[PDB]
């Protein structure tokens, strides 16, 4: 089976324009993902990390190719680089880093074995 | 696994599900088509998943705000009620169930905040917000207060803000413009400023919540409050002689509470569209049909004019309908999720005096008001490619790559330079920006090539791109 | 000052203007709306000026290629013919009167090149281009030639070129894609190559023109030619028994001549749009209406199927329609101007043997571009030249500089490197606006307290987008 | 200072400013455009690629706020256009006009004179 187009507005212009559900958080459709993604808009508009938007879009609406079965999300390298910058901003506005964006769940690096986006 | 020649309806447990089965039995008693009403837990979570595969119910019952998301995925079918039937229901309820012009569900009930007041302490309620400060000082002499409600959540504080021309998103032609937010304008500005005045004038506490709001009114410690039909059951228990009326008018204009609309959509995967359509139109939406559901558990206000007029005899339901008609219908778009934290942040900061009124609303306009990114900019594009050496017959592996591409917004040029004797300069002084890597890191890959050696293949993985000069 | 409650129509003098007034009288004889048909000189020049201010006619008659320019200015109004009426005319004629989706005028007639043959010298004409070389050598024995026509202008030579898949601009969705020129592809490549073969095989002369083309056929010195309906009146006078037929098929495919379409559009300034609409639909475009116009002066082929089928009884008109249906509809865009010199340059150079077929068409592909306001173009400006250090009198001088955004997207694609030898990490591409051609200049400066030093600088003659690393 | 170019066809060029009166004799741009549009068949035919620039340089010449005199085309351009377009005029019943006399323009963009190639 081939891949689908990205129906979400904020995650259209990225490095890719193709995605496959379900996503890495647990959403089965993109309409539900967008319902939860838009709550990150203050953190994006604030700009703790410049890569935040790409990181969020790589999770909630992950890259996919019809050459490979498994989807392509971000790495631990990206996650830790974003969490370092943005967790202090969340903590000061009364929020903690969510379980859904756990950097331990994602792989360490774009290995020969695994594969993810930096 | 889909039902053919029978109906199966999903509705939440707190709704009158036994009452809907009464109508389901009447449909079986007439048509010879059995109707199975059922109430699963988290049906709004379930419905997208089951409908996407093809399974699920024929009809689905839920508030209208959620249906916009299902309609976008194409899980609901398009309904076709004639002009005659469209007149049966109120005009504003039809607007709540409309995605990109096409009608996607039948309205049933109408929920909205209403002004609940103490008849003993206050036989005649206030028509205006402006007279409440004056009313409170008179009740403070008697050891009471005028008005108390949940200031934390935006849902309860919004009616005052939206009165003078505030809005979440503009709904101009059966479509919600995401980049058209009205929290920063003078309409919403004046409402919140009046609300903040009440707080620092000691008519109201900034840190009042839903618990203290209800507890105050139930003990007769406050003359008024603001809450939906759901909380009537608690107020009945307190034995406070009470009445529900229209919300007060700020600066002449009416207060606009967010309006929920219990709706009933048909599934696209359902083969029983005709059967489902008649059940909703002919059987359910009648004075007999709605009474059957309302008797089990109350719907409050209803879309059908005929039965609503009968139910409006109870002044509480009539007050809910009047607040609904005047009120703002809640956006069904998923960008509404950002609205809640935005106003809740701005209200609490404006209430505590940590931030001013004008600054808080300007930050809400920035953080939760939709900018798109440009598709032709110099950005970092991603792709997959199988790495293999050209003159070496052996294996290969799938690897992720990243390349730069896009049109730089700077204009390239090349103006001619003047060379004198002993000062022979270049013929031209050019400027030209190319999309290129700003930051990159090394990569490598051992290649298990049988009948030889395992040699490594290196390439640079791009971390970021930027427009830089040609000669650099 | 527009006419209200009455009609006034403009149409060229060479058209059947008295015949159209007959239908104009019929509209007055039914409706009670007087219609004044008139034929001013250079009406296509007049129409933009008069319509722009608000004056002018209600209806306007001209070839469809010029209506694209009026439609861009917004001088023509949008017509609204129902599906029933759209079926009356041929489908391809509707495509000729369409600017950015909106229909701007009603088609009337159809002009297109057709194969004219000498019945005495050749009773049955050739269906294929490839057999002409063989036919010519048989007629050269009898002191004659097979085919002769105007080789200089592209309009006459294009049908052969466009046969195997050549085209000026691709017209896919009611719109001409300007950046989609089909002069360089293999379709146009093979046609021009076959044309050049005929020239150097002494079947045809490179320097043949319209004058020699007609003069040859009229005196019975050539068996065939290629020309429109306009030249029939001359051939009738020569008393050469002739016939007009379908154009020959190159490599199986049909030859595609440029098709003109006499069209009738409504002025935007007109308040009588509905009145004008009835006149064109109900009164004019009928077997009675078009016969009244055709009787005064012939339209040849027509868009309306009913009358066309009657006119097709004459095999000449039927041949024009067959060539038109198969033919390429002529672009109405003003970017078409560049196409004409491009192909006319490539054809003459390929015919004379000055340039090859592949090179000539590649240059035509490039030069046709030649319009965007942000493109890499040659900007002019003035600057006072003065010597550094040595204080000297200055002079005001013209310079030329390149500036603009190249339309190609710049990239930087990653390279795979095995050996530890000094390699580039990235293989990038990026186009910069730079000078293509320039010439040296000099300028003496009258410096008192010293000598007259000269200042050198290059004056830019043309710019072009080229690679960053070049 | 100079004025902006009100004519439509001569807007997008190497320059965007002009000063009246022009080199033919027109005192206003409205009159220049009224006579420029008579060259539209010759433009549509496309005898010379530089034709439009040459015509726009004469009828609506370049001007600069740094110099008094206006800036027209050179004889080098004129002769290159006239060579190509006179045969097209002859076959459509026209000759090269006195208003576009190449002798009136300077030979090249010299130190003394100044013009656009
Ligand atoms: C025509 C089109 O849709 N292009 C897009 C563009 O993002 C990219 O160039 C391409 C990869 O080749 O993927 C797709
Ligand atoms: C299953 C798993 O490894 N979960 C990890 C947990 O070990 C770790 O403590 C946490 C960070 O607080 O991230 C997650
Ligand atoms: C009227 C006007 O806006 N003129 C400007 C001009 O000053 C500038 O040199 C150039 C930049 O593209 O062209 C434009
Ligand atoms: C061929 C011809 O008539 N050329 C004339 C020339 O005689 C005259 O001197 C000049 C005005 O300077 O205009 C040009």
Curated annotation (Swiss-Prot), chain A:
Glycans are attached at residues 17, 102. It is found in: Cell membrane. Almost ubiquitous. Largely expressed in adult heart, skeletal muscle, ovary, and fetal kidney. Moderate amounts in adult liver, kidney, pancreas, spleen, and fetal lung, and small amounts in placenta, adult lung, prostate, testis, colon, fetal brain and liver. Residues 1-118 form the FZ domain. Residues 1-118 are extracellular. Ubiquitinated by ZNRF3, leading to its degradation by the proteasome. It comes from the Eukaryota. Changing residue 115 to V: In EVR1; loss of function. Disulfide bonds join 3-64, 11-57, 48-86, 75-116, 79-103. Belongs to the G-protein coupled receptor Fz/Smo family. Interacts with MAGI3 and NDP. Component of a complex, at least composed of TSPAN12, FZD4 and norrin (NDP). Interacts (via FZ domain) with TSKU; TSKU competes with WNT2B for binding to FZD4, inhibiting Wnt signaling and repressing peripheral eye development. Interacts with glypican GPC3. Receptor for Wnt proteins. Most frizzled receptors are coupled to the beta-catenin (CTNNB1) canonical signaling pathway, which leads to the activation of disheveled proteins, inhibition of GSK-3 kinase, nuclear accumulation of beta-catenin (CTNNB1) and activation of Wnt target genes. Plays a critical role in retinal vascularization by acting as a receptor for Wnt proteins and norrin (NDP). Lys-Thr-X-X-X-Trp motif interacts with the PDZ domain of Dvl (Disheveled) family members and is involved in the activation of the Wnt/beta-catenin signaling pathway. This is Frizzled-4. It comes from Homo sapiens (Human). The lineage of its organism: Eukaryota, Metazoa, Chordata, Craniata, Vertebrata. The chain holds residues 43 to 160 of 537 of the full protein.
From Swiss-Prot, chain B:
It is found in: Periplasm. PROSITE patterns: SBP_BACTERIAL_1 (PS01037). InterPro entries: Maltose/Cyclodextrin-bd (IPR006060), SBP (IPR006059), SBP_1_CS (IPR006061). One of its GO terms (biological process) is maltose transport. GO terms for molecular function: carbohydrate transmembrane transporter activity; maltose binding. One of its GO terms (cellular component) is ATP-binding cassette (ABC) transporter complex, substrate-binding subunit-containing. Pfam families: SBP_bac_1. Keywords: Periplasm, Signal, Sugar transport, Transport. It comes from the Bacteria. Belongs to the bacterial solute-binding protein 1 family. The complex is composed of two ATP-binding proteins (MalK), two transmembrane proteins (MalG and MalF) and a solute-binding protein (MalE). Part of the ABC transporter complex MalEFGK involved in maltose/maltodextrin import. Binds maltose and higher maltodextrins. This is Maltose/maltodextrin-binding periplasmic protein.
Swiss-Prot record, chain C:
One of its GO terms (biological process) is maltodextrin transmembrane transport. GO terms for cellular component: ATP-binding cassette (ABC) transporter complex, substrate-binding subunit-containing; outer membrane-bounded periplasmic space. Its main location: periplasm. SUPFAM superfamilies: Periplasmic binding protein-like II. One of its GO terms (molecular function) is carbohydrate transmembrane transporter activity. It is found in: Periplasm. The keyword Signal applies. Keywords: Periplasm, Signal, Sugar transport, Transport. InterPro entries: Maltose/Cyclodextrin-bd, SBP, SBP_1_CS. It comes from the Bacteria. Belongs to the bacterial solute-binding protein 1 family. The complex is composed of two ATP-binding proteins (MalK), two transmembrane proteins (MalG and MalF) and a solute-binding protein (MalE). Part of the ABC transporter complex MalEFGK involved in maltose/maltodextrin import. Binds maltose and higher maltodextrins. This is Maltose/maltodextrin-binding periplasmic protein. It comes from Escherichia coli O157:H7.
């Amino acid at each position: 089976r081939r891949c689908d187009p990205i129906r979400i507005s904020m995650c259209q212009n990225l490095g890719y324009n193709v995605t496959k559900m379900p996503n890495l958080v647990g959403h089965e459709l993109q309409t539900d993902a967008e319902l939860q993604l838009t709550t990150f808009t203050p953190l994006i508009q604030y700009g703790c990390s410049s890569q935040l938007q790409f990181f969020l879009c790589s999770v909630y609406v992950p890259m996919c190719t019809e050459k490979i079965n498994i989807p392509i999300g971000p790495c631990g390298g990206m996650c830790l680089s974003v969490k370092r910058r943005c967790e202090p901003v969340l903590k000061e506005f009364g929020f903690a880093w969510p379980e859904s964006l756990n950097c331990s769940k994602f792989p360490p690096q774009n290995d020969h074995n695994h594969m993810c986006m930096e | 696994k889909i039902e053919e020649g029978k109906l199966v309806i999903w509705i939440n447990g707190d709704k009158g599900y036994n009452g809907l089965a009464e109508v389901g039995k009447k449909f079986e008693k007439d048509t010879g088509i059995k109707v199975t009403v059922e109430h699963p837990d988290k049906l709004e979570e379930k419905f997208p998943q089951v409908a996407a595969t093809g399974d699920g119910p024929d009809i689905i019952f839920w508030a209208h705000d959620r249906f916009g998301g299902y309609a976008q995925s194409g899980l609901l079918a398009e309904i076709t009620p004639d002009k005659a039937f469209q007149d049966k229901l109120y005009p504003f309820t039809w607007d709540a169930v409309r995605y990109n012009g096409k009608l996607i569900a039948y309205p049933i009930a109408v929920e909205a905040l209403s002004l609940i007041y103490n008849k003993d302490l206050l036989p005649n309620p206030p028509k205006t917000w402006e007279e409440i400060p004056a009313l409170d000082k008179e009740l403070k002499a008697k050891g009471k207060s005028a008005l108390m409600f949940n200031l934390q959540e935006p849902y309860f504080t919004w009616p005052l803000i939206a009165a003078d021309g505030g809005y979440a998103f503009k709904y101009e032609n059966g479509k919600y413009d995401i980049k058209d937010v009205g929290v920063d304008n003078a309409g919403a500005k004046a409402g919140l400023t009046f609300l903040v005045d009440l707080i620092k004038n000691k008519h109201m506490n900034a840190d009042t919540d839903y618990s203290i709001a209800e507890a105050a009114f139930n003990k007769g410690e406050t003359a008024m409050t603001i809450n939906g039909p759901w909380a009537w059951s608690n107020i009945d228990t307190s034995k406070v002689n009470y009445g529900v009326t229209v919300l007060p008018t700020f600066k002449g204009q009416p207060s606009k509470p967010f309006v929920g609309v219990l709706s009933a959509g048909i599934n696209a995967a359902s083969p029983n569209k005709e059967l489902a359509k008649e059940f909703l139109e002919n059987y359910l939406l009648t004075d007999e049909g709605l009474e059957a559901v309302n008797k089990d558990k109350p719907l409050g206000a209803v879309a059908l004019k005929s039965y609503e007029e009968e139910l409006a005899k109870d002044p509480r339901i009539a007050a809910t309908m009047e607040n609904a008609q005047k009120g703002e219908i809640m956006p069904n778009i998923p960008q509404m999720s950002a609205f809640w934290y935005a106003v809740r942040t701005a209200v609490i900061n404006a209430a505590s005096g940590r931030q001013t009124v004008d600054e808080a609303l300007k930050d809400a306009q920035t953080n939760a008001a939709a900018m798109d990114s440009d598709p032709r900019r110099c950005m970092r594009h991603h792709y997959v490619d199988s790495i293999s050496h050209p003159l070496y017959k052996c294996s290969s592996k799938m690897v992720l790559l990243a390349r730069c591409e896009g049109h730089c917004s700077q204009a390239s040029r090349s103006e001619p330079l003047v060379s004198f004797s002993t000062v022979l300069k270049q013929p031209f002084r050019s400027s030209c920006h190319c999309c290129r890597p700003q930051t990159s890191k090394l990569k490598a890959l051992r290649l298990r090539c049988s009948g030889g050696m395992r040699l490594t293949a290196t390439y640079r993985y791009i971390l970021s791109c930027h427009c830089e000069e040609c000669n650099s």
